Design a protein around this ligand. Structure first.
Ligand SMILES: [K+]
Ligand SMILES: [Mn+2]
Ligand SMILES: [Mn+2]
Ligand SMILES: [Mn+2]
Ligand SMILES: [Mn+2]
Ligand SMILES: [Mn+2]
Length: 136
RNA sequence: ACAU
DNA sequence: CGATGT
């Protein structure tokens, strides 16, 4: 209903799907960019959406912040809840990097706690999430 | 049918 | 038009 402006917004960006994947996190209120992941040669949109949330959790935890995280990805929000990224991406040499990062993100979830609310950004009501890359 |  | 997901 109401945007929680005191929040962190995260989003994937890509060149192809599967393709080059990156992600960033921004202050929902100001748009200030707070982190940006270096492009990963091959990944899926949903893997990046997932890594973005987990990085957000780790970022806020390190800084003792209780802000929620917004993501526009139904899939990634569920993967984080389940602590299991059920990606269909083949495991081969090409995809080894992204799969390592995803496996490690899952491992972090299974060994750490958080109270961070993970909220659905309501794109249909509010427009693009503020971490969007503007490529669509 | 919803979300990317 | 194609792909990734529940
Ligand atoms: K969107
Ligand atoms: Mn997104
Ligand atoms: Mn795994
Ligand atoms: Mn986007
Ligand atoms: Mn367009
Ligand atoms: Mn489009």
């Amino acid at each position: 209903e109401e945007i929680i402006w005191e929040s962190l917004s995260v989003d994937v960006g890509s060149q192809g799907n599967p393709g080059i994947v990156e992600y960033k996190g921004v202050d929902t209120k100001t748009g200030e960019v707070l982190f940006e992941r270096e492009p990963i040669p091959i990944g899926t949109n949903n893997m990046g959406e997932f890594l973005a949330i987990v990085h957000g959790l780790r970022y806020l935890k390190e800084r003792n912040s209780r802000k929620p995280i917004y993501s526009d990805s139904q899939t990634a929000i569920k993967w984080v809840k389940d602590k299991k990224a059920k990606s269909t991406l083949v495991r081969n040499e090409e995809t080894a990097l992204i799969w390592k990062l995803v496996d490690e993100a899952e491992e972090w979830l299974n060994t750490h706690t958080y109270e961070t609310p993970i909220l659905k950004w309501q794109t249909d009501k509010w427009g693009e999430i503020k971490a969007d890359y503007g490529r669509k």
